[PDB]
Design a protein around this ligand. Structure first.
Ligand code: NA
Ligand code: NA
Lengths: 230, 230
């Protein structure tokens, strides 16, 4: 599996002039190793990025399809924080030729209750029937520890490895080892230059859906952590 | 009051190539009379319009601010279908230098109950305290007959005149005749080349927030109906 790093700008930066300067910085970054890089940005900045961003990386929408496809954009994030509704959108996007970063993850109450693996497994079980055969090459899954984002609680490296393996286990049990061995599963908690290398080394962590560090020079460090993933 | 026509593209057209062709058609349109024209489009098309649309018209976002301001966009629609939440957003947008098309209007149940004027009056009463003094020149109000959009019921020319006067009456009663005499109040029901002239002639109708006809050559007919508004 090729390591995968998505930069999720969220609602940033606040001006198109800042977006263009960020793209200029990214275009000079020296990537090491083997890694697939995607950058998601606010809708009004997608034309700028599609025109100006280095063509060995790909642009992503933050949510959704014919409008963004008319610019040549191939990716969207889905589910970033109803599972039936979300799975339907995954089906629609794949059927219409999009590649997707499908997000899952549990809130604080389920984590504190000891139900994290049960909750996330059920989210993926609802995703699974919606993926068309032949479309699994166009799917990446991101685990978002919602319980550790804005709560005053922090996730460990072991938490990341454990929750990514939970997802791989349920793929293997429901759709088979071939699919489970090819799907990239990302950690989408707090990822920084100070922890990306130890996170990347985890066996079931295939990359990242990066938040605030995607707006900084440190994004290249996170991209280049792929060399620590076996 | 200068007649005001806003073209609300909603979630249209489906490709940027179609958006550019529509802009090319609009750029050759011959406007008659005295009218202020604004065009609102999906977020991913706003850069295209801001670059290519005739500079005697203005571009609008469909909802919201620093991101669109960084392109030079001066307008947004608000409230198109909580009033306290909506009024707060109006306050925020005006305080940050935006001009707004603030939408109101009642659903089918309130219309059938005989409560249309009471419901719309209360919506405007919640809007009124949120407008900063000195900002009323940057406010336009649109009446949307939600009860006549997708319900199998149709609004009359008299309904349009009546509901626009209801809005003007409550401005006059709460903030005074000077403000009530300057604020443009738009009809935002179904507006077509076949009814725009009789609608424009209504004394309290100052223009339109146009839906599907804004995507067609007939938009210029609606823009040019200003000559029938005294
Ligand atoms: Na790894
Ligand atoms: Na009139």
């Amino acid at each position: 599996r090729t390591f995968f790093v998505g930069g999720n700008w969220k609602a940033n930066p606040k001006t198109v002039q800042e977006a263009e300067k960020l793209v200029e910085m990214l275009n000079g970054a020296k990537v090491e190793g083997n890694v697939e890089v995607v950058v998601a940005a606010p809708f009004v900045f997608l034309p700028t990025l599609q025109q100006k961003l280095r063509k060995d990386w790909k642009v992503s929408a933050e949510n959704v399809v014919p409008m963004i496809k008319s610019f040549g954009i191939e990716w969207t994030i889905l589910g970033h924080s109803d599972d039936e509704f979300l799975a339907a959108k995954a089906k629609f996007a794949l059927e219409n030729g999009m590649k997707i970063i499908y997000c899952c993850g549990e809130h604080l109450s389920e984590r504190e209750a000891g139900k994290a693996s049960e909750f996330v497994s059920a989210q993926i079980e609802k995703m699974i029937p919606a993926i068309p055969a032949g479309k699994w090459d166009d799917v990446v899954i991101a685990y978002e520890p919602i319980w550790a984002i804005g709560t005053g609680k922090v996730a460990s490296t072991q938490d990341a490895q454990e929750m990514c393996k939970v997802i791989r286990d349920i793929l293997a049990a429901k759709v088979g080892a071939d699919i489970a061995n090819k799907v990239r599963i990302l950690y989408g908690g707090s990822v920084k230059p100070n922890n990306c290398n130890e996170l990347a080394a985890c066996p079931d962590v295939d990359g990242f859906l990066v938040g605030g560090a995607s707006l900084e020079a440190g994004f290249i460090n996170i991209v280049n952590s792929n060399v620590h993933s076996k």
